[PDB]
Amino acid sequence: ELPTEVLDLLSVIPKRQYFNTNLLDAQKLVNFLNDQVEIP
Amino acid sequence: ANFLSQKFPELPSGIDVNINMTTPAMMISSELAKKPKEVQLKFLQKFQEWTRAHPEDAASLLELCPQLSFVTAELLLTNGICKVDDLIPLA
């Protein structure tokens, strides 16, 4: 399940249909965030 | 979308933006970046744990819902965690 913080955040920005510009690869991003990223 | 109805059935659709005067991307930045630095960091660390515990779930959600994909990116950008040039490897 998603924590409430995430939920609110997903709602506060433009509708997902206004995002179809360049985008990012979910699978790369997740593996990137898990292993390669350390949130300050 | 059985994946969502099972795991993520309450996904927000986003706000309605009047893209005849304001661009989504600019709103996206002002939206996350008007928030106190603690938020972005709180979200991303919390999220980081969540996505490490659930790589399949997390990644597949980012696969289908792009607001989170870029919401994460923009928060990475605003804190300086990652730069645009670090996001293109993801792209």
UniProtKB/Swiss-Prot annotation, chain A:
Top-level lineage group? Eukaryota
Compartments, record wording: Nucleus; Cytoplasm
Functional description taken from the UniProt entry: Component of the cleavage factor IA (CFIA) complex, which is involved in the endonucleolytic cleavage during polyadenylation-dependent pre-mRNA 3'-end formation and cooperates with the cleavage factor NAB4/CFIB and the cleavage and polyadenylation factor (CPF) complex.
Assembly mode:
Component of the CFIA complex, which is composed of RNA14, RNA15, PCF11 and CLP1. Interacts with FIP1, PFS2, YSH1 and probably also with RNA15. Probably interacts with the phosphorylated CTD domain of RPB1/RNA polymerase II.
Q: What else is known?
A: Present with 5350 molecules/cell in log phase SD medium.
State the protein's name: mRNA 3'-end-processing protein RNA14
Q: Report the portion of the entire protein shown.
A: 630 to 669 of 677
Curated annotation (Swiss-Prot), chain B:
Q: Where is the protein situated, by its record's location annotation?
A: Nucleus
The record's keywords, sorted A to Z, are: mRNA processing, Nucleus, RNA-binding
Major subcellular site: nucleus
Please give the superkingdom of this protein's source: Eukaryota
Note the coiled coil stretches, chain numbering: none
- Gene Ontology BP terms: mRNA 3'-end processing; mRNA processing
Oligomeric state and interaction partners are given as: Component of the CFIA complex, which is composed of RNA14, RNA15, PCF11 and CLP1. Interacts directly with RNA14. Interacts with polyadenylate-binding protein PAB1.
> What does the record's miscellaneous section state?
Present with 6350 molecules/cell in log phase SD medium.
The entry's protein name is mRNA 3'-end-processing protein RNA15
Q: Which gene encodes it?
A: RNA15
